[PDB]
Amino acid sequence: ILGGREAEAHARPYMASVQLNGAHLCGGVLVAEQWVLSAAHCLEGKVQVLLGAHSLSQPEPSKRLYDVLRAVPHPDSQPDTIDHDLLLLQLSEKATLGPAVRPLPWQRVDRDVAPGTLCDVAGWGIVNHAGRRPDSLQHVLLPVLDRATCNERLMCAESNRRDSCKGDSGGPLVCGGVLEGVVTSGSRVCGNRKKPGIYTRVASYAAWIDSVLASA
Numbered sequence: 001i002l003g004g005r006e007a008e009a010h011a012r013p014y015m016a017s018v019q020l021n022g023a024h025l026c027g028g029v030l031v032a033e034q035w036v037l038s039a040a041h042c043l044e045g046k047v048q049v050l051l052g053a054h055s056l057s058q059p060e061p062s063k064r065l066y067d068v069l070r071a072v073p074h075p076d077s078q079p080d081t082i083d084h085d086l087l088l089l090q091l092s093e094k095a096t097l098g099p100a101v102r103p104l105p106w107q108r109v110d111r112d113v114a115p116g117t118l119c120d121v122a123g124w125g126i127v128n129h130a131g132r133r134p135d136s137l138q139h140v141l142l143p144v145l146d147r148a149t150c151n152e153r154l155m156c157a158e159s160n161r162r163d164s165c166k167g168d169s170g171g172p173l174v175c176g177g178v179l180e181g182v183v184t185s186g187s188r189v190c191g192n193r194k195k196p197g198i199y200t201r202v203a204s205y206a207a208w209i210d211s212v213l214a215s216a
């Protein structure tokens, strides 16, 4: 997260760090007791998911690390596109739930967010162009763009200096308390106004998300 601030500790209890070789790789959103929604290029080795965290390195009682029983890339995802860029990760067991660890509801109605609406994106992504990695969860509020400016399964938000960036991929874009977007995982210039943030619209994939939650 560029131009954001440190989030309040555990105030976003759905936030997951998707980790490889014990290091934060991507963001995730807890969408059910046993499932974390991230993006597809995060999977691309041994995948783990950290729930209940604010600090990636410090002790916190609500911190739990989980292995992954199954990883489910969207089937139309390809390694060179940002199309269909979602990944469902099934935790080794049900998340121990509580005030720090709790699923966020997700948009099932396929209707765009109103342009100009400020939405919240959070991550342990880089916080400047030198690649500084934050120990603690960051976030920022961002204005959703009209589709004509962004130029149907994608949405854009303002990238004027405030932005999602590397290591925020797979994280949440949340509007009026509901998950609307997942940070795409493709390389892009960050914090340039003429090059908006891109996010996958979960409402577009409502049938696939239910199907995967339903084969459990």
Ligand SMILES: NC(=O)n1cc(NC(=O)N2C[C@@H](N)C[C@H]2C(=O)Nc2cccc(OC(F)(F)F)c2)c2ccccc21
Pocket (backbone or CB within 6 Å): 024, 025, 026, 041, 042, 124, 125, 126, 131, 132, 133, 134, 164, 165, 166, 167, 168, 169, 183, 184, 185, 186, 187, 188, 189, 190, 198
């Ligand atoms: N949505 C975005 O703007 N973006 C989404 C991107 N994709 C990723 O971040 N990916 C895809 C895959 N390799 C996985 C991920 C990744 O690179 N994670 C990563 C790599 C090194 C360190 C790291 O931790 C920290 F962020 F630096 F804290 C995270 C990305 C990369 C560069 C610039 C922008 C980017």
